[PDB]
Symmetry: C5
Subunit: 114 residues, 5 copies
């Protein structure tokens, strides 16, 4: 598996606008919401759950990188795998998107797979 | 269990105004005090104890996130479970509230369970 | 045991003014010096030694919090247990005080036991 | 092996201009892109994969230092070993360079092997 | 053993001027270069190797502290044990000094052994 697999979705020119940390089923988790830097489109919500999904091994690196990009407000590409989380009230509050990578974005390209 | 269970309480548009770190019964712990950004309401105090309560697995993430939000002074939602901590002098100094999540707020927003 | 036990001493309205990191007997340790925010009184010197004293479990959280409050320069209450360290040259350089907690202070009170 | 082996390559007077974090084959990884501080030359890309290559033991230190130099924007020397990564779509997106060290640079010399 | 052993050397009123991170013999390492705040004297170089020397247990704490003092540029006392590293290309690039402690300095004294 790879962040860059074409079975994963991605959204360019996004800004991490919200950050949440919590716990579910003995597992710390975090969620982010991102919006287009230019104000178009609809928001993206993605979460990482420490003890769950094939992406669990990168939980710490993703949380640290999310905090970093959240704190600068820079434009990034968010990479997700859709339809991962399954507890309905969790998905309702957040989404079923697993966060699988984060890329900085230059003026006219993003530094990550497409 | 989940941060967003309806048996947990939450408080919105709060600012983390104080932070304490200590040890009790061989456990590092931390506590926070939050006040409404606009000066209304009554202060909220919540604590996390590494090694105690069902929320112990999320101690590190919550301590890191509390420090982050403390440093920015931004408005947040604090999620708690009431009536958890026992030692009466500890409760009297701080509270019996376990900290169970932290969410950012964007203009009385709050990105977390509701 | 608890940071707030009345067998521990505390000092309010202090600022962390020096920081040292070293190793002794295979243990990383750190020490801090605090002074009253108004410059009155005598400095408080306290140390934490990674594998030693009943306060060993909180070494990492105390080191991180000491660095945090040192870098902000904000007023704090420092909590210590006296007469812990024993190596004379170490005690003469620093002190015998074990660091057992750190509380942020407002202008009117400190967020911690007293 | 050593960062400074003459079988590694290095590039001086660079600035870390992009940063990406993801997961591949159960390993967190990160990649950076660097460009000449003075606008000359061609960009350099290098990656570190947490449990792959001889350089895996330094994954955390390299990620922390890459983030540090990325956030300061200061001039650095980047050290790489060529032709390490092999998944073609990964190499196409980033490169086959393994990141093996990072050195601060003054206006005249870089503090690292040469 | 102790940072303050009289068999260790130290240099007061120094500023950390350069920082390098790499790997040698499967171990992360870092080096720092320091110069007198007054711009006098010869530079001091010292290195820490995770996994090597009796000071290996404090590698993480010294790296974190070196990074901190590097970012502030404040005056510090550097504590070293001479003649520890022996790979000649390494020593010639950096030095044989093992870093064994870091102390903040005021105007009257540095907060560490002497
Ligand atoms: C009238 C019309 O043509 N409308 C658009 C068309 O403009 C868009 O084409 C370009 O898309 C560009 C960015 O492409 C990505 C991206 O990098 O973010 C590619 C992603 O593969 C795609 N992700 C998914 C799951 O499809 C992503 C999203 O479509 C997009 O980011 C919207 O996200 C949200 C939640 O709002 O876009 C860039 O946006 C250029 O402006 C576009 O011209 C086209 C693709 O977006 O769709 C047509 O409807
Ligand atoms: C006349 C009247 O109705 N007065 C108030 C009414 O205005 C309040 O409604 C709005 O509440 C908003 C905040 O809502 C929450 C919050 O998210 O912070 C919902 C929480 O569920 C609630 N938590 C608990 C345990 O009750 C929390 C607290 O009630 C509130 O934060 C005060 O807490 C403290 C310690 O001070 O409020 C917002 O404040 C709007 O401006 C209000 O219009 C309503 C809810 O507070 O109660 C009525 O008594
Ligand atoms: C006519 C001519 O000879 N042109 C250039 C010549 O100017 C260059 O000489 C000086 O090189 C200086 C930098 O040296 C290094 C470096 O530290 O960056 C040595 C490195 O070993 C080398 N790395 C590799 C893998 O070969 C590196 C790269 O060549 C260089 O950094 C460019 O890399 C990229 C991706 O653009 O240079 C410095 O640049 C001086 O200003 C130069 O005068 C000479 C070496 O670059 O090459 C000749 O073609």
């Amino acid at each position: 598996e790879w962040t860059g697999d074409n079975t994963n979705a991605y959204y360019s020119d996004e800004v991490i606008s919200e950050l949440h940390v919590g716990q579910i089923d003995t597992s710390p988790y975090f969620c982010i919401k991102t919006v287009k830097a230019n104000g178009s489109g609809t928001p993206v919500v993605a979460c990482a759950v420490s003890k769950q999904s094939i992406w669990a091994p990168s939980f710490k690196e993703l949380l640290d990188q999310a905090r970093y990009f959240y704190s600068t407000g820079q434009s990034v590409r968010i990479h997700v795998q859709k339809n991962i989380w399954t507890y309905p009230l969790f998905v309702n509050t957040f989404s079923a998107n697993a966060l699988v990578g984060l890329s900085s974005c230059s003026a006219t390209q993003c530094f990550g797979p497409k």
